[PDB]
Design an enzyme around this catalytic site. Structure first.
Site, short mmCIF file in Angstrom:
data_model
loop_
_atom_site.label_atom_id
_atom_site.label_comp_id
_atom_site.label_asym_id
_atom_site.label_seq_id
_atom_site.Cartn_x
_atom_site.Cartn_y
_atom_site.Cartn_z
CG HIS A 86 -0.61 0.59 2.43
ND1 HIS A 86 -0.36 -0.20 3.53
CD2 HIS A 86 -0.42 1.87 2.83
CE1 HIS A 86 -0.02 0.57 4.55
NE2 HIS A 86 -0.04 1.83 4.15
N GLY B 195 2.37 6.50 8.69
CA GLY B 195 3.82 6.64 8.57
C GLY B 195 4.62 5.47 9.13
N1 LIG Z 1 -2.25 0.55 14.19
C1 LIG Z 1 -3.16 1.46 13.88
N2 LIG Z 1 -4.13 1.70 14.65
N3 LIG Z 1 -3.09 2.14 12.75
C2 LIG Z 1 -2.14 2.03 11.80
O1 LIG Z 1 -1.21 1.24 11.80
C3 LIG Z 1 -2.35 2.93 10.64
N4 LIG Z 1 -3.23 3.94 10.81
C4 LIG Z 1 -3.52 4.81 9.82
C5 LIG Z 1 -4.49 5.87 10.22
C6 LIG Z 1 -5.75 5.65 10.72
C7 LIG Z 1 -6.32 6.87 11.01
O2 LIG Z 1 -5.40 7.85 10.71
C8 LIG Z 1 -4.27 7.24 10.23
C9 LIG Z 1 -2.89 4.68 8.58
N5 LIG Z 1 -3.16 5.49 7.45
C10 LIG Z 1 -2.09 5.89 6.54
C11 LIG Z 1 -2.43 5.25 5.19
C12 LIG Z 1 -3.19 6.20 4.27
C13 LIG Z 1 -4.66 6.35 4.66
C14 LIG Z 1 -4.80 6.86 6.09
C15 LIG Z 1 -4.58 5.74 7.11
N6 LIG Z 1 -2.01 3.64 8.42
C16 LIG Z 1 -1.71 2.77 9.41
N7 LIG Z 1 -0.82 1.77 9.18
#
Ligand SMILES: N=C(N)NC(=O)c1nc(-c2ccoc2)c(N2CCCCCC2)nc1N
Length: 245
Positions: free
Chosen positions: A46, A196
């Protein structure tokens, strides 16, 4: 990383920092990864799917800070960007969220191991720790969900593995979680991965060996009650990894 602690690359010397070059020449952080052999970094599909061109990316090893150089670091171009053919995205959950980056410097070389640069062992097939086992996660991702900036200094924290049965519950993730994913969270929901941190390592100690058990993939929010971090289950992808490396 929400909560946890600041760290340096000596405490996670397989950690790879992946950046993208822009039209115009600015460079921005993309995602984490893990060095599994001198020439190969493993990450999440992704991270790259919107810009799948290998020439757009830069990989650092031995780096402890986001936007400044760390002494002893190595910079690499991406000689091979391999995304998983069966990748899919629904609204939250990414299936087969795993990617391989073959790294090569401008001098045509792979990673030379050092005090700040080492490989991480892959697990043996279908062999993960039991639920409730404490593991570590590392990354440059957000420190709070509401933050605009990423931290300048590397972070890590501890989360506990959650069973497929518990993560499968509707108040958690329902059928969004498959058997090729692992859930992990804090008992207080106090600390977690976040935006991130994607692509970076979930490391567990198995049988006396530090093992790449998971790859940060997704979650609903960060450090939210009943919403664990979701990780690509590395022990279910060993043939795909072997075949492509
Ligand atoms: N462990 C968790 N609880 N969460 C995460 O690991 C995680 N969380 C988000 C996230 C969720 C809400 O704000 C940011 C996220 N994003 C970036 C990708 C692009 C679309 C946005 C979501 N990637 C992730 N890998």
């Amino acid at each position: 990383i929400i909560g946890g602690e600041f760290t340096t690359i000596e405490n996670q010397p397989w950690f790879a920092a992946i950046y993208r070059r822009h039209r115009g020449g600015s460079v921005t952080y993309v995602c984490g990864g893990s060095l599994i052999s001198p020439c190969w970094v493993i990450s999440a599909t992704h991270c790259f799917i919107d810009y799948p061109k290998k020439e757009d990316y830069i990989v650092y090893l031995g780096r402890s800070r986001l936007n400044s150089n760390t002494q002893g670091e190595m910079k690499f171009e991406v000689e091979n960007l391999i995304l998983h053919k069966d990748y899919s995205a629904d609204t939250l959950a990414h299936h087969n969220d795993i990617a391989l980056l073959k790294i090569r410097s401008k001098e045509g070389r792979c990673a030379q191991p050092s005090r700040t640069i080492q490989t991480i062992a892959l697990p043996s097939m279908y062999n993960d720790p039991q639920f409730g086992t404490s593991c570590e996660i590392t990354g440059f991702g957000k420190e709070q969900s509401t933050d605009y900036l990423y931290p300048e200094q590397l972070k890590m924290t501890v989360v506990k593995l959650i069973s497929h049965r518990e993560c499968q519950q509707p108040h958690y993730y329902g059928s969004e979680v498959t058997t090729k994913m692992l859930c992990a969270a804090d008992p207080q929901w106090k600390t977690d991965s976040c935006q991130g941190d994607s692509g970076g390592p979930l490391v567990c100690s198995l049988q006396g060996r530090m093992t790449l058990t998971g790859i940060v993939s997704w979650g609903r929010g960060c450090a939210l009650k009943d919403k664990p971090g979701v990780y690509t289950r590395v022990s279910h992808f060993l043939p795909w990894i072997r075949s492509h490396t």
